[PDB]
A paper describes a structure:
The heterotrimeric RNA-dependent RNA polymerase (RdRp) of influenza virus is composed of subunits PA, PB1 and PB2. It is responsible for replication and transcription of the segmented, single-stranded viral RNA genome (vRNA) in the nucleus of infected cells. Transcription of viral mRNAs occurs through a unique “cap-snatching” mechanism. We initially screened metal-chelating compounds by CEN enzymatic assays, followed by a cellular phenotypic screen and then optimized the chemical structure to improve the pharmacokinetics and safety. This culminated in the generation of the compounds BXA and BXM that target the CEN in the PA proteins of influenza A and B viruses.
To verify the reduced endonuclease activity of the I38T mutant, we purified the isolated endonuclease domain from influenza A and B virus polymerase with either Ile or Thr at position 38. For influenza A, we used residues 1–198 from strain A/California/04/2009 (pH1N1) with truncation of the flexible loop (Δ52–64:Gly), as previously described. BXA has a butterfly like form, with one wing comprising a metal chelating polar oxazino-pyridotriazin-dione head-group and the other wing, a lipophilic, difluoro-dihydro-dibenzothiepine tail-group that makes van der Waals contacts with certain residues of the active site pocket. As expected, the head-group binds to the two divalent cations in the endonuclease active center, each metal ion having octahedral co-ordination through interactions with the protein, to the compound or water molecules, as previously described. Conserved Ile38 intimately packs into the V of the tail-group in identical fashion in both FluA and FluB, making van der Waals contacts via its CG1 and CD1 atoms. In the FluA crystal structures E198 makes a salt bridge with Arg124 from a neighbouring molecule so no clear conclusions can be made about the possible role of E199 residue in BXA binding in the context of the complete polymerase.
Author numbering: -1 to 51, 73 to 139, 142 to 198
The structure:
């Protein structure tokens, strides 16, 4: 069972199509980087579930680069929040801060450090496939139920992969050698 076939079966087609466009834009082939194809789908789903819990969250992820920065610029212009160097994933209109969503197959503490290091005001929220999470100042933003649902979906994706013998590959491809 190919990872590419898993992605197209396990994820909603709107998620798959946006993941494909994002990979084309950054010059990556979903037929070759199939684990990355799956990771982008998973992360994209988490961002939509995050902004699902008028609307508290603007979704930056899932847009072509130009539109993504247009939304970021428009928000900064109307709130005076400092424009970030790196594209974030969400904007929280209640806390008035951008959010960076991370999903990792490794230890959350390790991935949190990697993310915090790369961006040096953007709130960070890391999820794992084991039910763990780590967030800036231990401020998890959402209520308990909302995070429990994200954790359950991630764990379900993991078990759906494991049943098709895809988990081990997916786990090891996150960080290079
Ligand atoms: O939006 C993201 C992004 C994140 O937000 C993230 O948390 C991790 C990684 N990201 N990257 C995603 C991405 C997203 C989710 C899971 C893995 C990857 S792996 C690199 C890659 C991404 C998108 C397309 C592509 F072809 C890639 F090679 C790029 C980093 O440059 C800003 C846009 N972006
Ligand atoms: Mn992003
Ligand atoms: Mn992210």
């Amino acid at each position: 069972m190919a990872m590419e076939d898993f992605v197209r079966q396990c994820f909603n087609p709107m998620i798959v199509e946006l993941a494909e466009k994002a990979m084309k834009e950054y010059g990556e082939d979903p037929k070759i980087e199939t684990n990355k194809f799956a990771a982008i789908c998973t992360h994209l789903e988490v961002c939509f579930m995050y902004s699902d819990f008028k609307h508290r969250f603007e979704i930056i992820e899932g847009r072509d680069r130009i539109m993504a920065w247009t939304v970021v610029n428009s928000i900064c212009n109307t709130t005076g929040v400092e424009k970030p160097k790196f594209l974030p994933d969400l904007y929280d209109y209640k806390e008035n801060r951008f959010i960076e969503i991370g999903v990792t197959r490794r230890e959350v503490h390790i991935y949190y450090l990697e993310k915090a290091n790369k961006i040096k005001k953007t709130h960070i929220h890391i999820f794992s496939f084991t039910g763990e999470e780590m967030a800036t100042k231990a401020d998890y933003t959402l209520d308990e139920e909302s995070r429990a649902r994200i954790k359950t979906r991630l764990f379900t994706i993991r078990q759906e992969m494991a049943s098709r013998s895809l988990w081990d590959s997916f786990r090891q491809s996150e960080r290079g050698e």
